[PDB]
């Protein structure tokens, strides 16, 4: 009606105002400013360890905060916790639903979360007096598949789902404390800020949204991608983040200037990005692709620095240890590989 | 030497036991038949799953027939982007696609000229030629044959198929629509469509799905053996 048309016109005017403000704050691209800096060398990494035991496509992995333990889920109904130093299997947790799409490790190391096509984020207690691992809580309330989950502390976890919403849960009560709405497509990944006061999420609507955890509102919305955003990661500083999308490009967005900074794309690359992860200092942006290998990017110059080609199937998982010591990659070939540089 | 402490060796032994358990579980899972159940909303898939055997996530029904173990995965409760999770079912033995023969007359809830049977045809076209199901056979169940037979006397197929040039009797129309559904397969060499008209007695269609999965298992073994 007339009211709806007026509201649409007002929304278009606000969008034009936002774009004009972004253009006004856009004077010099980050690529121009970094043109005088010394490029990194050819970043060569070797497979230090290969973790075997999964019998199906690995879908997610997460490092523990101690940079030694990690958890991985592989849709064979198993959540395996690995000692990455000795390739030992610390735990093998059987899952009720073998359609897991995500997994997480609590920063305290006491819990691991996982979820998938069952729309349930299951929390597992690792430190039990019985010596086994049990389901501490089963969070329900998402009407779409669980796509990502990240622990804030031992009692708070934020999940992203295919029902175009993200939910901040209270694990003790099992109830959704806050629901984040505004995405018009399936939310495919989220990344918590270093201080866990903010988090970004990338959705199939080719847009990323910055959410305030405490308030529950969408602070900012970043566009530019031409397809679904399957991966997101925060810059270690916390004032920027990177998105990996099906359009075979990675993009670095900054929060303060509210716009894109650089695109990490190559003509030889035509497959989408399934995972992104920054280096310890943020100089390197590692991204996993469907062409079975992970490409290392000079985050400050958009120049490809190295290739991690060791997987026979799509590289679905990525992760850099909290100390920057190593980067682990999971893949649909049922193997995880820990990579590291050489002097 | 060994350069392993007592606790390190005990942890290695625990990891070996975990590996043994994982191998046993993998063998058990490999000795199984996984079927993906698809179809429209009111396609009779609930009736089918009743004959074979809280959250609107995924529903797994586990049943056994003639020392063969099946796990059907009803996924119709997922309203999100299908292309974002359909690759999770790459390794399913077969896809059970259910369509309703009665839907050649009823129009969709939107009532925008999009026939329900046309929606089923679109879904079958999308699934059959999906990049993840190039070698996956499809067991097509044509549901509600009895009330379709009852309704075929009043309204013919001309409403849904303007190109239909056959008599409005039951068997000719059923064969026509079955051929149209089978003709959507652009991979007639790599995959086979096992079409069956579901009967009131469960045993007939459970036997049909058993035979179809046995045949596709033999064909997969032949493909892994160099033959075929």
């Amino acid at each position, epitope marked *: 009606q007339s009211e709806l048309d007026q509201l649409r016109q007002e929304a278009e005017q606000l969008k034009n105002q936002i774009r004009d403000a972004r253009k006004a704050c856009a004077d010099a691209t980050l690529s121009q400013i970094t043109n005088n800096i010394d490029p990194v060398g050819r970043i060569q990494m070797r497979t230090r360890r290969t973790l075997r035991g999964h019998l199906a496509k690995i879908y997610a992995m997460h490092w523990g905060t101690d940079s030694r333990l990690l958890v991985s889920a592989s849709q064979d109904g198993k959540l395996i916790i690995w*000692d990455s130093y000795t390739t030992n299997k610390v735990h093998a947790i059987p899952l009720r639903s073998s359609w897991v799409m995500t997994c997480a490790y609590a920063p305290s190391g006491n819990y691991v979360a996982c979820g998938g096509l069952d729309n349930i984020c299951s929390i597992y207690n690792l430190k039990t007096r019985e010596g086994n691992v049990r389901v501490s809580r089963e969070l329900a309330g998402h009407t779409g598949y669980l796509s990502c989950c990240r622990f804030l502390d031992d009692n708070q976890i934020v999940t992203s789902s295919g029902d175009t919403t993200c939910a901040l849960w209270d694990i003790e009560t099992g109830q959704q404390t806050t629901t984040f709405t505004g995405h018009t497509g399936d939310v495919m990944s989220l990344s918590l800020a270093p201080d866990t006061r903010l988090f970004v999420s990338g959705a199939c609507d080719a847009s990323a949204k910055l959410w305030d955890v405490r308030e529950g509102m969408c602070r900012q919305t970043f566009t530019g991608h031409e397809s679904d955003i399957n991966a997101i990661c925060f810059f270690p500083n916390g004032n920027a983040f990177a998105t990996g999308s099906d359009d075979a490009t990675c993009r670095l967005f900054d929060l303060r200037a509210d716009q894109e900074l650089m695109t990490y794309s190559h003509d030889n690359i035509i497959c989408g990005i399934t995972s992104v992860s920054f280096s310890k200092s943020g100089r390197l942006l590692l991204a996993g692709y469907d062409d079975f290998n992970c490409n290392v990017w000079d985050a400050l110059k958009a120049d490809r620095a190295g290739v991690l080609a060791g997987h026979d199937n799509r590289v679905s998982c990525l992760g850099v240890t909290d100390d920057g010591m190593a980067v682990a990659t999971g893949s649909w070939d049922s193997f995880l590989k820990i990579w590291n540089g050489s002097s | 030497g060994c350069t392993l402490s007592a606790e390190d060796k005990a942890a290695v032994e625990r990891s070996k036991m975990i590996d043994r358990n994982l191998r046993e579980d993998g063998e058990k899972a490999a000795r199984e038949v996984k079927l993906l159940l698809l179809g429209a909303g009111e396609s009779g898939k609930s009736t089918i799953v009743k004959q074979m055997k809280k959250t609107t996530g995924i529903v797994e029904t586990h049943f056994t027939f003639k020392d063969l173990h099946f796990k059907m995965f009803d996924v119709g409760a997922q309203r999100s982007e299908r292309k974002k999770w359909i690759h999770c079912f790459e390794g399913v033995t077969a896809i059970i696609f259910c369509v309703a023969l009665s839907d050649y007359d009823l129009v969709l809830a939107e009532d925008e000229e999009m026939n329900r049977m046309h929606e089923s045809m679109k879904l079958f076209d999308s699934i059959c030629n999906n990049k993840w199901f190039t070698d996956t056979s499809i067991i097509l169940f044509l549901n509600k044959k009895d009330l379709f037979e009852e309704k075929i006397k009043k309204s013919p197929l001309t409403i849904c198929y303007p190109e239909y040039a056959g008599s409005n009797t039951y068997e000719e129309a059923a064969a026509y629509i079955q051929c149209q559904f089978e003709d959507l397969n652009k991979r007639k060499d790599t995959k086979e469509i096992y079409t069956h008209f579901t009967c009131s007695t469960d045993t007939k269609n459970v036997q049909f799905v058993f035979d179809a999965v046995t045949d596709v298992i033999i064909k997969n073994n032949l493909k892994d053996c160099g033959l075929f």
Partner: single-chain antibody
Amino acid sequence: VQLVESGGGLVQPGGSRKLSCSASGFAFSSFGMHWVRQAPEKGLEWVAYISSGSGTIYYADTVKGRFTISRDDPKNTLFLQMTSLRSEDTAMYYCVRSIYYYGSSPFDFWGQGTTLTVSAADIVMTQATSSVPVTPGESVSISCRSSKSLLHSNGNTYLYWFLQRPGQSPQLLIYRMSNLASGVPDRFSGSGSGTAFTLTISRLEAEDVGVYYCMQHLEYPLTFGAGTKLEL
């Protein structure tokens, strides 16, 4: 978690006796199990060990060839078949559960004990002090020394501290020389580098009296200290 043992009593020397240990409240099959004896008015002495899955079995030298340790996982029982018992076997036998993985806490739970009475290159852990007078409110530091360096190449220092309250089974306080066991208040702390270790109990309070034992877990002939007694 509960471990109950039975089968003790008066045994003629040269005879045989079977000790049992029924477990409850925890995953028995996932835990390696130890037998630890304590002669009357003497310190602890490790006897035998059976791994999770019965894959690995170890014995002390004084019991090799006469004691057999076996487990029955389905019925959650641990056995110790003893043959040709000598008067030196008169002790109280404890059932100790112990799970091993990265960051694990072995020897965490001990059974109540069953009394047996027979009527007639190892690392040496030294606890020079045998009795220390204490007062409630002050801090008491207990010293320990080992013949070998317990610091392995992986960085772990395999030293364990146990508390045995009067008329009670030992309980774990510190594992691997620095990590406080679950259920232990922060008043207990451990230190040391390679061969000398100390356990300080700041703000000592009652019910902390009893014998404190040090155990090494570097080489499987596990050896306990003489035990330092804390008298109020």
